[PDB]
């Protein structure tokens, strides 16, 4: 589905969008919010959060959309792999524009290359720029 | 790119994601709202509206995400092509799960087959079901 995998010197962990029925370790979500804040503070990142509303009965309801799984995978990688180590992410869907931008900025600020294989392309993020040239 | 095209007996119209600087005819958006409300009336279709929030200093700001271009294309087709005519749509991205369901329901409730060629696959929607078997 919307799955991402991180591969760390042969070792593999899978991540999905937020599922409160199967929560990841809170330490990982804490790292994500910490990285998001540092991106906002240190490189002027405009952090996105998405939500929807459904036309239910007796009024209306809003529902926060869960951030995409590769951001969780990247936070896990920043927690578990050495400083400056390349982060290798595999996705089964095409990386969206907002996640692609997130990856660029992470590669710059945390001084780690990111190699992402999404549905269609290898994206190599180095120092804030991607090998795809932002066409994918 | 968020573009869709409709092809009607060789004639071709392109649709982009909603742009207030370049908006299409009012009749098209009215038809789409009529379709969406008919879906709710007949099958109870959960019509969602998506939003993004970006937190900025001057004013923390919410932006509405605009519906995807193929629903506009389908509304245009329902307006401008004869009853029961097949609707042929081309998209340069993968159709999302919500739009794929929308197409399935339109094919049933408006008695039109839809042939959609997205980024990777031909989807042939007939009577509520797709040739991809909902794996794409
Ligand atoms: Zn994304
Ligand atoms: Zn790229
Ligand atoms: Zn869609
Ligand atoms: Zn299909």
Residue numbers in the entry:
A (entry chain A), B (entry chain G): 825 to 960
Question: Can you list sentences taken from the study reporting this PDB entry?
Answer:
Here we report crystal structures of the DYW domain of an Arabidopsis thaliana (A. thaliana) plastid RNA editing factor, OTP86, as the outcome of a solubility and crystallization screening of over 100 different DYW domain constructs from 30 PPR proteins. OTP86 was characterized as a site-specific factor for an editing site in rps14 transcripts.
When employing the coordinates of OTP86DYW, structure solution by molecular replacement failed; however, four copies of a truncated model missing the gating domain were successfully placed in the asymmetric unit. Furthermore, the strand length of the β-finger is extended upon activation, still maintaining the original backbone hydrogen bonding residue pairs of the inactive OTP86DYW. The side chain of H890, which shields the active site as a counterpart relative to the zinc coordination sphere (formed by H892, C920 and C923) in the inactive OTP86DYW, is repositioned far away from the active site by about 13 Å in OTP86DYW★ (compare Fig. 3b, c). Unexpectedly, THU could not be located in the electron density, which implies a crucial role in triggering activation but not as tightly bound inhibitor.
